[PDB]
A and B are shown apart, each in its own frame.
Chain A
Amino acid sequence: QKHFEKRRMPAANLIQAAWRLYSTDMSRAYLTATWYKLDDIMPAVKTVIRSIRILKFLVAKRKFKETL
C-alpha cells in the first residue's frame, strides 16, 4: 500500500502533463480571434509553447518510471 501510494503523485503528474500537452492542439484556450491572429503572424510561438510541454511530459514520464 505505502509503496504503491508513492506512485500516486507522479502518476497524477504524468496524466496532467499528457493532458496539458494534448490540449495544446484542441483546447478552447486557443480558439479565440487573438490566437488565430497570433498564430497567423507568428506561428513559432505556439510551436514553442508545445515544445515546452513536450519537454515537461518527458520529465514527468521519467519521474513516474523511477517509482517502480
Chain B
Amino acid sequence: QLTEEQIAEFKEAFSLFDKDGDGTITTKELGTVMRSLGQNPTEAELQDMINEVDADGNGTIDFPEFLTMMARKMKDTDSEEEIREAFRVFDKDGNGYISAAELRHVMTNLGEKLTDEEVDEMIREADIDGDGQVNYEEFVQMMTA
C-alpha cells in the first residue's frame, strides 16, 4: 500500500537514526537523535521504545520493522479499542460521553500532563454538544484515522 518514493522518505528518517548505515537502530542512535532535539529520555525508556517494535530480540529496530511501524501509526484495530478503553476509565456514566471540563481536568492533572495550550487544542478539535459533553468514540475514530 506504500508508494516507492514514500518508502524512500521513511528511509531518509531511518538513516537519520542509523547514520553509520549498519541497517539498525539501537538505544544509542535513538537517544542521540532524541537529545539533539532537546528531549531527555532515560536509558530504560529507550529500551522500552525499542522493545515495542524489535521482532527479533537483539535489541535493534531494522528498516522493515521501522517501515511497518510508520505505516500503521495509530490506524489499527487494537489501538482504537485500547484508546476507547482509556476514555471509558474516566466515564462512569457509560453513555459514551465525557464533559469537556472533566476531560480538561484529567488531561492537565494526570500522567504526562498536557499544557494549557495542548488541552485547549484538543478540546477545540473535538466537537461539543450544548451541554458540554464530547463523544469520545467520535474522537477516537478521528485520531485513529
State the A residues within 8 Å of B (CB). 4, 7-23, 26-28, 43-45, 47-52, 54-59, 61-62, 64-65
Contact = CB atoms under 8 A, between A and B. Distances in A.
15 contacts: A4-B89, A13-B111, A15-B107, A17-B112, A18-B83, A19-B114, A19-B143, A21-B73, A22-B142, A22-B143, A44-B15, A47-B10, A55-B53, A58-B69, A61-B82
Given A11-B86, A44-B15, 20 more contacts: A8-B89, A11-B89, A12-B111, A13-B112, A15-B107, A16-B107, A19-B107, A22-B74, A23-B118, A28-B121, A43-B9, A43-B12, A44-B13, A47-B9, A55-B30, A55-B49, A55-B50, A55-B69, A57-B79, A62-B48
Contacts of B101: none
Interface residues of B, number: 45
A contacts with B: majority SS = helix
A16 B10 CA distance: 25
Given A16-B107, A61-B82, A54 B69 contact: yes
Contacts of A43: 9, 12
